[PDB]
Amino acid sequence: RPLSELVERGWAAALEPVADQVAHMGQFLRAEIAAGRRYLPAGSNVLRAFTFPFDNVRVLIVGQDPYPTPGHAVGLSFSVAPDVRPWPRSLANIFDEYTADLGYPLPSNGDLTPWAQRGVLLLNRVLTVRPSNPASHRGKGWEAVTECAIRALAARAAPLVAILWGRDASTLKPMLAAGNCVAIESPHPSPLSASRGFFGSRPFSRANELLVGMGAEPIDWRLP
């Protein structure tokens, strides 16, 4: 399938510069199965963050690698399928900040699809992993794809708030700071930072203050 077939219209145009790289990663995953190795998430979920409208993205949440545990990774950073229990530690931590910052009760489950619908891009820098082998697909070719995605997002004549939850600020800030209406939430605690900087970081309320300050609508963060 060409990009226009795999991702939303705006994303297919945004990702044209890395269309050969996206083809190549498809070949890599087929070669992994031939090699007798597995990957997550499911092939159908790998580009899932790019199936929500490129023009409507208001917030970027950056992760590093998909969940390594079988049955966790669903192609949106930190999300899990609605029947997954208990939550992964990172997600439990995110939901504790969610209740504290926003005053909402604990979500009913770990499915962040509503954030994706509302223009929250849940982007991992690396979109696949070998099950039970954390960070096993680093350097396989995803970094160039997700860099093109972020630079394209930054280049829009449109507001963006970046939240960095994958700790690589010195690699990510240059891709973004080259934008016109991008605010980066600093500092950069990750959800596993927990009480050493993540809890009380107010990422959700701060993103809305920053969007309203750039003349955009806030995100409705409320999960079921």
Ligand SMILES: O=C(O)c1cc(=O)[nH]c(=O)[nH]1
């Ligand atoms: O393993 C994690 O907590 C994790 C999941 C995910 O999607 N992204 C990330 O950076 N970490």
